[PDB]
Amino acid sequence: LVHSSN
Amino acid sequence: LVHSSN
Amino acid sequence: LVHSSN
Amino acid sequence: LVHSSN
Amino acid sequence: LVHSSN
Amino acid sequence: LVHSSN
Amino acid sequence: LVHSSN
Amino acid sequence: LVHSSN
Amino acid sequence: LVHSSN
Amino acid sequence: LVHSSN
DSSP states (O other): OEEOOO | OEEOOO | OEEOOO | OEEOOO | OEEOOO | OEEOOO | OEEOOO | OEEOOO | OEEOOO | OEEOOO
16 A cells, blocks of 8 residues: 555 | 545 | 545 | 545 | 554 | 556 | 544 | 555 | 555 | 655
8 A cells, every 4th residue: 555645 | 544635 | 535445 | 445526 | 644454 | 556636 | 543634 | 646456 | 655565 | 554744
């Protein structure tokens, strides 16, 4: 899992 | 689970 | 944003 | 499941 | 931001 | 699964 | 579990 | 951005 | 940013 | 697990 708003 | 309003 | 694999 | 209003 | 694998 | 609004 | 409003 | 192989 | 292999 | 808002 990876999350980033960039 | 991930939540973000960004 | 919401993510869930459930 | 994914939700986003973007 | 909230993350949980539960 | 991949999601991005970019 | 992680929570942050940043 | 979200990625998961689940 | 969040990463987890769980 | 890694989290960073940077």
